[PDB]
Amino acid sequence: TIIIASDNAIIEINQALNTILSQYLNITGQNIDIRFDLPEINSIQSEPTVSVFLYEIHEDLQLRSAESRRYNPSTNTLLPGWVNINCNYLITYWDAQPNNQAAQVMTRILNALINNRQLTGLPGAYTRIIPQQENLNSLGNFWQALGNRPRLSLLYSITVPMKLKNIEDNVIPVSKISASVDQKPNLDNSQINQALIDKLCVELGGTEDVRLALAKVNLTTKPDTENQENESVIVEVSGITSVTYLPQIKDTLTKWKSSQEAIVKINGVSIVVSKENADKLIGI
């Protein structure tokens, strides 16, 4: 069955419970008050009432699923997600022989709960009718908290989805598809990076001080999607170097970019630097 996710699920569940309880309780010509909160501490009751107490709410992990966001291409909207909510109720009868009024009212409530395994207002909800209650210790502690004599109660569990507030309104559908396939040299990126770092070390002087200053300098290259006798790469330099060698490295990179000649040649393929960037290099 289908249940519509809503942001007001608790009140809807309360209304469905009120409807079914009224139908099954006012069937004998008697009117019984139905309240959705517990009576006060050491309070008195003038009329017999039935209390429906929502005492616990948690996300139902058992019913959680890994679903993707739903898309409506007609309206270019990304539909909101939802969170499953488990609500637990405690129905009790409060007074104002084996055939006493309390037993009859409790029987009517039990009949309603038994016949509403699939809730009338929410057929698609996941319900657990009259689950196994607690032991005598928990009942005693709860009725100590309420400050009144212990009474019989019935439990009801129901899980409904609640709509989230994350919705996008301008998600354009894909209507046009374009692909371009170009030739790539049979080269390894790490080989190009190592060759470029070696060329930089040689140009800087080749002194062991230069090698020390280039220990924590990372140079990477990217294909340039913008000739057939050479290939263009995007040189990116980042890391840490000394104060003295940072301007020298930047000047060398600018000189490489300006010159149109091949800097290194690997496997017969000549590499030409067409774009460089070294603004992420710390030169402390």
Binding site: I172, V174, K176, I177, S178, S180, V181, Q183, P223
Partner: peptide
């Protein structure tokens, strides 16, 4: 390009 619903992909190959 995105507002017009166009998807562009670039592929390089070595033969």
């Amino acid at each position: 390009d995105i507002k017009q619903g166009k998807m562009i992909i670039k592929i390089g190959m070595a033969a």
